[PDB]
Amino acid sequence: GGTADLEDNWETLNDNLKVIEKADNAAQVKDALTKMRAAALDAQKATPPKLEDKSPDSPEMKDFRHGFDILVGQIDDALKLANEGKVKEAQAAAEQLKTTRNAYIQKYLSGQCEVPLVRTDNPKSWYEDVEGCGIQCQNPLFTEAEHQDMHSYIAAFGAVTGLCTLFTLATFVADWRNSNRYPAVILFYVNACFFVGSIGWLAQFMDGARREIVCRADGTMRLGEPTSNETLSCVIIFVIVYYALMAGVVWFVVLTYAWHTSFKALGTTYQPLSGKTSYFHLLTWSLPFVLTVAILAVAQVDGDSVSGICFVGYKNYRYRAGFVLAPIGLVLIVGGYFLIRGVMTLFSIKSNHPGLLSESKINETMLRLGIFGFLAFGFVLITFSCHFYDFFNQAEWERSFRDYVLCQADCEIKNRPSLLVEKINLFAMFGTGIAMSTWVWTKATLLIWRRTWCRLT
Amino acid sequence: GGTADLEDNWETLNDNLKVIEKADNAAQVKDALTKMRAAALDAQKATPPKLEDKSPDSPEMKDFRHGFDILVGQIDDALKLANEGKVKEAQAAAEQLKTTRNAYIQKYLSGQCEVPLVRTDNPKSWYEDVEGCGIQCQNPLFTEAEHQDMHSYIAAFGAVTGLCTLFTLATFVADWRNSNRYPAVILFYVNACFFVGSIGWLAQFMDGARREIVCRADGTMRLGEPTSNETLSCVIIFVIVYYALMAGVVWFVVLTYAWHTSFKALGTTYQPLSGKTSYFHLLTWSLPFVLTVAILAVAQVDGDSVSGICFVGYKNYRYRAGFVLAPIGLVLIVGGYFLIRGVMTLFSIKSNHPGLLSESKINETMLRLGIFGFLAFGFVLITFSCHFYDFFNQAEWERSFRDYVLCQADCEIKNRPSLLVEKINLFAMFGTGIAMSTWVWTKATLLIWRRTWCRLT
Ligand SMILES: Cc1nn(-c2ccccc2)c(C)c1/C=N/N1CCN(Cc2ccccc2)CC1
Ligand SMILES: Cc1nn(-c2ccccc2)c(C)c1/C=N/N1CCN(Cc2ccccc2)CC1
Ligand SMILES: [Zn+2]
Ligand SMILES: [Zn+2]
Ligand SMILES: [Zn+2]
């Protein structure tokens, strides 16, 4: 529709977008934008090929038209700067139009592509035998109401864990000469991990970051990352999240180990852990590193719009068992062994030395530690179960997704993943940090912060 | 959001919209529009009250923002004219902003109103005990795909009937000295009616007319028309449609009557209808008039977005039986009587005068008439059945509509009307005209049009 066809004006915008990129003076930059503005306004007068059947006042026609409202405003912001002779930054403002261009060309000049498949020229983004279509970034199995529901749940829980574990780090360093002692300082490193994990989980809430993390440049979803031309954003969120949570679950095994061995103090001033502290840092930081490095090697980092992060085994449930179920499983056997070895010792001390737990100081932090070890084991047990549910059921959910994608070209989805199971899972993973941070919710912490403010007068 | 709240900037636009209406000079008109533009742009920066939960890039946020793109463009068209000192037409361009204002205030500053009920200050538009909400114009029981499907069906069929019956009128007047003879000229008046009916049915396809016909000024649907402040558009479409189709069904009874009585010619040059022609025009034009005048009296004209016209008994199935089922029913008993009286005569002539139907001229148009009478009776029989299905089932469809409206404040509709039954109905009502127009699809018509072009050389 209009003077020129929709595809013609879109090709005009594309050609002039590339001429700005390779332009020398403001005269040619200004020339492109003023011919681009004319094109956008003429393309706006048009009717897209699969919208002949739609009303002119329809939300589709109004949104197609709106794309050119966004584009003309952006053209004007670049046109203002090009008029200001500021070539450099005018080419930078013109680089913003590529976002609108890629989204609206995809939406309205879809071609052979029908939702959830989207128009993309990147052959690595193409789905099955379908030439030129890729699976849309936004998870087509979940509604906008459910996406927004998960985002709220993660924001609320992420922010709580974030601030709780941040305070516990602050309380520890505020009294580091005193608090940097084992087995107490284990909880500091556990809290460091959940804090770093939270930052990874809350990254999606930063203006437009969720798309930058989970979508490819072409609007298709992130798959088999690390991959060429794409940004590091996906893998950075993966590394932050996966390393931080895998390190934190190792420090949990360390906690259970420390609780079991600190029974050897016998209330007495002996330090059973003395000299063992070196291995604690070697195991907790080397073990998740080796795993992370291996995931980047196999390139099995995939993104999710509902989760908002990049993770291992989102598309391949096989890699999810080997890199999530297997470590969490193994942390439960080893951590579970030391807790059983801990209770065995407690009833052995109870028989051999009745009244040795007589009131305090050392004996008080001992049971607080054993409560934390059991409380954190319980949460690891819920995540393991949630991850297992996903693992043993993902094959059918993937077959239901193929059967829907392929049909969409009534047409509905048989089964899909459980957001309740993922929220139950998220609660346990955030709850391990919330519960672990309350290690510092002592009368002594009030003293630490009283002396901290006195020294800040 | 922004400098001022959404409601504040919308109130600013409203106040300045009224100041333009009561303005004296261009300076104050120009002053309002430039303060209106600032408001629209600031209101565009805002987030509507029930859209805090929605993404900023969401289609809702993009459409809310788009309303101000439409408004600013309209403001500029009025601002261009006000700058041109053309106060008169600037106030006329400013009058266009009332359309956008009413639609977007309704959509995004909905208040206590939840779809399908819409925000309206007109108390005559308010639904049940709900204070300030009215039932939306667009039929909430039918999807945008089904609305667009009915519109296509009516356009295709309306245009065919329209052109077929237009040609038959043209063929008749092109040879009026010859063709203005009974019983043939009855088909001309039958075709006149279907043509006028088609124009009534095709009015909805004129740029934005469908809304002007079926919606109240406040965006609620047309009900109990004729009613104060509203335009005549609804009632004009009703009168055109109802009178034209009710007159056409009376001319059908006249046809059946004429076929029965023209048996009294006996091939012979006697004109049985001679002098009876006066009553034919008295009955066919007075009878639908009396009915139309009575519908406007009881004020039972309601509009429909899926049908696109205004009609009797859309909301009250009772009035639909009395003004549609009752006349169509009665036209079937009287028209049916004369067809049975016609066949009775044919077999009486066959017995009393074997070989009187020996070949032509008068005997040829006689059977063509009896085929038309039976062919048109068949179609009246389908519409009667379709109207009856609607009548005896509308009470539950209305209870399902209340139960949905009231719930919407999952939530779905139990049962709704049948578009197949209405399309079957439409086919028969359009088909009566299509079949009736083929009266003129004779070898003789080619002669008429050959002599018409010769006289146009
Ligand atoms: C990723 C991911 N994505 N989603 C997820 C979220 C929303 C929608 C769709 C999917 C979920 C629920 C996860 C869970 N990851 N695990 C949780 C267990 N943790 C180890 C661990 C950490 C602390 C305590 C105990 C165990 C590893 C990461
Ligand atoms: C109005 C209306 N609205 N709708 C309708 C259309 C779409 C959706 C929802 C509803 C329908 C199907 C109608 C039907 N009206 N009758 C048809 C019968 N005719 C008398 C008649 C005329 C010629 C031949 C035989 C009979 C009176 C008007
Ligand atoms: Zn002992
Ligand atoms: Zn817009
Ligand atoms: Zn006889």
UniProtKB/Swiss-Prot annotation, chains A, B:
Residues 175-182, 256-278, 344-368 are cytoplasmic. It comes from the Eukaryota. The chain crosses the membrane at residues 154-174, 183-203, 235-255, 279-299, 323-343, 369-389, 429-449. Glycans are attached at residue 229. Cholesterol binds at residue 314. Disulfide bonds join 113-133, 137-215, 234-310, 407-411. Phosphorylation by GRK kinases is required for interaction with protein kinase A catalytic subunit PRKACA. It is found in: Cell membrane; Cell projection, Cilium. Residues 204-234, 300-322, 390-428 are extracellular. Changing residue 439 to L: In basal cell carcinoma and ameloblastoma samples; somatic mutation; constitutive activation of the smoothened signaling pathway. G protein-coupled receptor which associates with the patched protein (PTCH) to transduce hedgehog protein signaling. Binding of sonic hedgehog (SHH) to its receptor patched prevents inhibition of smoothened (SMO) by patched. When active, SMO binds to and sequesters protein kinase A catalytic subunit PRKACA at the cell membrane, preventing PRKACA-mediated phosphorylation of GLI transcription factors which releases the GLI proteins from PRKACA-mediated inhibition and allows for transcriptional activation of hedgehog pathway target genes. It is linked to Curry-Jones syndrome: A multisystem disorder characterized by patchy skin lesions, polysyndactyly, diverse cerebral malformations, unicoronal craniosynostosis, iris colobomas, microphthalmia, and intestinal malrotation with myofibromas or hamartomas. Homodimer. Interacts (via C-terminus) with protein kinase A catalytic subunit PRKACA; interacts with free PRKACA subunits and the interaction leads to sequestration of PRKACA at the membrane, preventing PRKACA-mediated phosphorylation of GLI transcription factors. Interacts with ARRB2. Interacts with KIF7. Interacts with BBS5 and BBS7; the interactions are indicative for the association of SMO with the BBsome complex to facilitate ciliary localization of SMO. Interacts with DLG5 and SDCBP. Interacts with GAS8/DRC4. Belongs to the G-protein coupled receptor Fz/Smo family. The N-terminal extracellular domain mediates sterol-binding which is required for maximal activation of signaling. Contains a second sterol-binding site within the seven-transmembrane pocket which is also required for activation. The activating sterol is likely to be cholesterol. The extracellular site is required for SHH-induced activity while the site within the transmembrane pocket regulates basal signaling in the absence of SHH. This is Protein smoothened.
